[PDB]
Amino acid sequence: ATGDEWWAKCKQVDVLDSEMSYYDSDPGKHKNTVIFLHGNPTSSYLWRNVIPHVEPLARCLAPDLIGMGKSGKLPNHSYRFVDHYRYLSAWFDSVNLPEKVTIVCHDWGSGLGFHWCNEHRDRVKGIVHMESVVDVIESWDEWPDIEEDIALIKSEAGEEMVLKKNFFIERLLPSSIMRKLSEEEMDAYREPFVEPGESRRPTLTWPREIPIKGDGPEDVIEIVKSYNKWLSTSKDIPKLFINADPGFFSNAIKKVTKNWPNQKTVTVKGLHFLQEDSPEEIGEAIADFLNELT
């Protein structure tokens, strides 16, 4: 399935000064509702082979984060976590959601989805997360060895690799998928970023927001610190951690979340973009989680 076919199935809604594009399996329905949040450097297209397995049981929504996918681009090029949260939270308010929702999230979609849940604690039916942002990094030995990669990315050299060479799309993305994408699938990930320069800014700002205890950013640090604490006591929020083997962050998330209450773990084959290697198993697991809910 090509990008054209996927975004043909999506709609747009005005959000503050801009627009956001999103998949909606059942517009205007207050039945069981599941919202799928992608991260960097992907779009709603990441969920295309997962959502079919969930669609029969729930209205499925998959927004493109601001500056990503088919969503609008910000003239001032400022795409910090808080900028993404302003737009994403306004999107939540704009798609006729029922009172309680299930969030399925990945990577920075999980940072945003964890934060939105933490700020709307009475609206969360359940949370499925995978290769997620579950904590601040306080000791490097409990995380994959990215210290050097992050200092690089924060440097001007890293701006040149991302803005001019598209490092995140052309290198990081295929590096962390076990199979080989088709040309059509890769072109769908490329589509939002074909213009060199500032169109690729969201893919550079996202890794610069990594919460490193003592490297800032202190706004992200305390957002993550506060939703981690709440999730670590979230005894009556059903939670599914989908573990990717070998994964990337999965090993560290296993350790971080080991004693989180009310959390079931399922393991699938994948690296970081586990949706491209095991979409059927991931879909079936979310359906099982949904049926365990009802």
Residue numbers in the entry: 12 to 305
Manuscript excerpt for this entry:
Here we track the role of dynamics in evolution, starting from the evolvable and thermostable ancestral protein AncHLD-RLuc which catalyses both dehalogenase and luciferase reactions.
To verify the importance of the hotspot regions highlighted by biophysical analysis, we transplanted the sequence corresponding to the L9-α4 fragment from the modern RLuc8 enzyme into the ancestral AncHLD-RLuc. The resulting AncFT protein had lower thermal stability than the ancestral variant (with ca. 7 °C lower Tm value) but folded correctly (with a CD spectrum similar to that of AncHLD-RLuc and AncINS). Similar values of the specificity constant kcat/Km were obtained for AncFT and RLuc8, indicating comparable efficiency of substrate binding. Thus, AncFT’s lower LUC activity is due to a lower rate of the chemical transformation (i.e., the step after binding), as indicated by a 10-fold lower kcat value for AncFT compared to RLuc8. On the other hand, AncFT exhibited markedly weaker product inhibition than RLuc8.
